Design a protein around this ligand. Sequence first.
Ligand SMILES: [Ca+2]
Ligand SMILES: [Ca+2]
Length: 109
Amino acid sequence: PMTKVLKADDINKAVSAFKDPGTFDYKRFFQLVGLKGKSEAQVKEVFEILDKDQSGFIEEEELKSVLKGFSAHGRDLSDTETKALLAAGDSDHDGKIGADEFAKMVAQA
Ligand SMILES: [Ca+2]
Ligand SMILES: [Ca+2]
C-alpha cells in the first residue's frame, strides 16, 4: 500500500486535514503527507498506486479517488475539487496526469 513510501501517521494526519468536502488543496496535502521531498523513484511508487488500472496515467476518475489511494477510508473529491486538481497538473491539456506531470505537481507544491 501507500505505506511502502509514506508514513502511516503522516497519511492519517494529511487525510484528516481535508475531511471537509470542498477543501482539498494538493499542495498542503503533499506537505502534510510527507510527499514533498521524495525522490523521483519514490514519487513513481505513489503515482503507480494512484494509477489503479495500470494505464500509465492518472485519469480524472482516479484523481477523484486520490485520497483513497493514500487511505482506504478516505472520501472521494467532489467534481469541483477534481477539476481544480487536474487543472493544476495537466500541462498538455489531454485530461489526464502522466508520470512527469505528477512529478512536477510534487515539485511545485
Ligand atoms: Ca490509470
Ligand atoms: Ca496530461
